Amino acid sequence: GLSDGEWQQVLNVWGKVEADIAGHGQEVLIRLFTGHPETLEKFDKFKHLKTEAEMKASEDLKKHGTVVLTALGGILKKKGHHEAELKPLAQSHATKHKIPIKYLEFISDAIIHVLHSKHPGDFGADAQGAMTKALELFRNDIAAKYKELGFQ
């Protein structure tokens, strides 16, 4: 798990995301979709987006970005004690959305990328290290639920 100091850094970094949840959310999704087009196909409601320009102009994509980061934020504020918040997401993504664990790796990397892009020089080594551990914990706990379901 993460140390108390690491959790503090994670939640301090998250303060940046909360200042503009819609903006960070949009950029994370766009980064995910542009870098890994196979992910866009998992969204029937976003498959119509053929260009990044259309993605950037999609108010529904911004809307979903807000739903996604709000969920993650709630989970992060639990500092590891997130079984109740995490189990339902793990099961909805495996059974309903059919999202390979690899895609969660993609979005984790996208979050780190977006943080550096929006806060260059203000996302230090210790901060990236802590946020990375938090995302891996998130990812690993979802992976455990995936194995339970036998989903690949």
Residue 43 interacts with ligand HEM (CB under 6 A)?
Answer: yes
Q: Is the dihedral of CA 78, 98, 140, 5 positive or negative?
A: negative
3-state SS, residue 16: helix
In this chain, which of 65, 93, 131, 134 binds ligand HEM, going by CB under 6 A?
93
The size of the interface with ligand HEM (CB under 6 A), counted in residues, is 16
Residue 104 interacts with ligand HEM (CB under 6 A)?
Answer: yes
CB of 121 to ligand HEM, least distance (A): 25
- How would you class 28 by CB atoms within 10 Å of its CB: exposed for 0-12, middle for 13-18, buried for 19 or more? buried
Show the binding pattern over residues 62-81: x = contacts ligand HEM (CB under 6 A), - = does not: -----xx--xx---------
Query: What residues are designated binding site for nitrite?
Result: 64
